[model samples]
Target chain A: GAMNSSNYAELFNNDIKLFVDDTNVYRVTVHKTFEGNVATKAINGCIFTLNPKTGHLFLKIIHTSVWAGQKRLSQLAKWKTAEEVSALVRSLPKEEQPKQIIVTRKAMLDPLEVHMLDFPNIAIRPTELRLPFSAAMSIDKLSDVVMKATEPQMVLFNIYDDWLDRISSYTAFSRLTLLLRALKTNEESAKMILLSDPTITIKSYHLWPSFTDEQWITIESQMRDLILTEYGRKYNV
Target chain B: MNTVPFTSAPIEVTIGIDQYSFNVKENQPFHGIKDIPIGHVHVIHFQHADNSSMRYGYWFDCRMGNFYIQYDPKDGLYKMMEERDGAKFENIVHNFKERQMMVSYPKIDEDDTWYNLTEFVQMDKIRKIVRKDENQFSYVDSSMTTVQENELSDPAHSLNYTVINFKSREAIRPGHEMEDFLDKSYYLNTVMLQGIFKNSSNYFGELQFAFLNAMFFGNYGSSLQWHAMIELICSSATVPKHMLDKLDEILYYQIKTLPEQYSDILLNERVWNICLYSSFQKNSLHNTEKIMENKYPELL
Candidate 1:
């Protein structure tokens, strides 16, 4: 819990290897993060950069492919700041002291080259972040519609509560959630799907997405409960 | 010859984890058939002691897909089976271990054995066939083709030329919600109703018997009872407008819920049951006795 400078040295400079040299003895490419062999499932395998000057950290967690060396999967990237990454690692069991973290490029702009190429070219810049006045009014109108309805249950079910927002985004997320829930642990059975056509045979625990979205899981669980869906209905894998 | 066996009144049976008391709309006892393993059947609906506004049957399974199922008497759970042997037991149980049925074969010979309760259940008491999502299961159209008696000349029911005008291979969702009687009642419109659909009269209670018979037929999820009833109403010119009105407005609510009753579905751009955007209109003037007795009386 307490942050000390000397602790960072001890924690950051032990004997754990990244993929290639920065090695000669042996640099094993692992699927998730760990100190020695006590793996933490939540903390994703990331390439880290500590500022050295201020001890601030920058983390790049891979999304698409962890096996970048074999080229069977494409590399997808998700970047996190020092505070965000710290919050994640804090959940780690305190007994497993963090050791020599995998290091990446020091400069910020240097890492931007990773995922920017895969994204489609945009004709225009992203829209402003401010909430729309019309959206706010629609929320009020939806409430008013509910208030006026004689059939409140049906009205609530039919009304476009999330019709405009998060429908597509959550649709993708719900797919992931379905996959997560459907994932009966313990192997390469048809019930589990990890990195579709995962070019090589590796245990799925090594292949599944390290991070889970709390929001998506929470919402899906609620929807199933609301509709009285039998818990854990995997659509035949 | 095809008539259903029903109780004099709604009989409630508790089902599933949450334990909802559903009104068994239709019940059938198979007296002496041995070809198929099934012995009894039921079509149940969600029961609200005082609320009529809440009554609806499901269009699909609650998992929102359809799958085929069979009775597994050893445990009360229905075995949701796939057509191909290869697809068996790949997914033996669902996520949280709240199982509906088990996929059984003999290689590994294991059981998910962690369930909430223990009770002795009889094969004859098993009431309904369940949803095994067809659209979800990967199978060819050849797999869907079912064999029937059909009065065909040839002995082989599998012969392609003998089987024509197949309405659809039935698949229904695991549609259960105690709200709005959607738990489903078996006594209503079932595909067996089609036997009486072509007859142009309300005269001899033929349609009534057919409706009741469908309840006893098989407690299957993909019931075309209401759909066939709608077809009868639309196709038969001699069938009175009053009967149509009774079905479209009043008696329909007595059986099923959901705005699905009023609107037509356009599967081939010819019907309109898929106009799901329409909101539900609660008609409290639902008939219980009139639907069972008023126009169509049963043979005592």
Candidate 2:
């Protein structure tokens, strides 16, 4: 049911939206960003990159559902470099892009279900395969100008309701990772970092990573201990 | 049925980046360098920029630990869908939308065999040996997939108690291993939390706070206690002394201070009802015992 404008306050009270309360933010730690011969967990998600080494900014999107029911999956961990991300975006046929969302999703579920019995043990929500590019274009003058020049394509996926299990496996850290990735990677494509905490208005963003704090220190330490020890060559000065 | 605790032995893991890759060398000395003589497991970290672009990142485990692999490249952490079509940043004031998340369970054998589900293979293989437990492991380096790492640390290494310390072939489940099970369920909790909440955006702040805080607090208590509290309350039973004490403490310290901003929380329903029913049950049980004594006076 479409809620009337009068119900906005009530809706705000009742509905679940990320990044609504800044003061009461739920702090969490992410231990698993990539792991154990970790296959890239693809979704209707995209990753935008800029090789600080190269001025080139590019966007890498995954069609959540890929080829005739098979998801065409790629790993940024496997392909290094901003150009590689651009090449991945180029490989897909334009028409297949829409279906990529469906294929990626379908591959995850052996046989998809719409009703409760179909997924009793699992929780359900609406799953998305979106990029925040549009939001970037509208607010940031730099992104607005950059997007106009690049003519970036928007990607999407299939579903009536969404599920978190459909998106990731990392515990505690899953939501933060998605929001951070959704903002930072793509912003680089438009050649910008999200503004500092107070300035960032996306509502979904948590200031822990963007704003330096104890949690930020812990996250950096964790990354260095877990991921950097394994993949720190890129950071070699 | 693949038993509840996934595997007893450490499965092989291959950590990779955009180009360089390494296998977790058993008992390798790690000094926090990318090229440490000892190899560390890999987990990729990526970033998204304001322009909606993204970056790939990498990390290695300095202090090796046991963690689950729930996401894969195919089942990505985030994706796009039709509902968000043409949604823009300035849309916050105009065409604001929510992230639709999906949740589903993998098909596994009916007997709670978590390892049987092939979907979680990568994580099922992770086992780490801390410098503290170096002497505990047996070296099987020459052998691949056969007792991969020696000197396994942490109770999770026991693998449902079937194999203790990778050196002993005895079957024993560690008392402390429940954390891993909790870890898996916690991931599921995020799935449940995020699907309904939509990534905690600007518009849905209150709702997100209420749900997340309630859940975060509630999950800390015993599941069995939670279940009992519900049953007793629903039956109009007298509240137990212990339950009443805790309930009153929570109401007084936590919920009572917050005003209508937190009115969105169904605190009244969740807490009040439980307390009332507990009180009712306690009284009813007392009265029932008295009646039994009177009726059996002769026999007594």
Quick one: best lDDT, which candidate? 2
Docking class of 2: incorrect
For residues A147-222, could you state the per-residue lDDT of candidate 2 as single tens digits? 3433334322211012223332122233333333344334332223233344534323221223334544444344
Reference-based lDDT, each prediction: 0.25, 0.26
lDDT of 1 by residue, A93-193 (tens): 64431332222222212122121222212110111111111111122332343334332121212121222244443254234324333332212321223
Interface RMSD values, listed in order for every candidate: 21.8, 17.0
lDDT of 1 by residue, B39-136 (tens): 21212233223433323221111122223333344742223333343233223222112332221111122521111010111111111111223433
Candidate 2's displacement at residue B92, Å, is 38
Interface RMSD of 2: 17.0
Regions of candidate 1 where Cα sits further than 4 Å from its true position: A1-237, B1-221, B249-251, B254-256, B259-270, B273-300
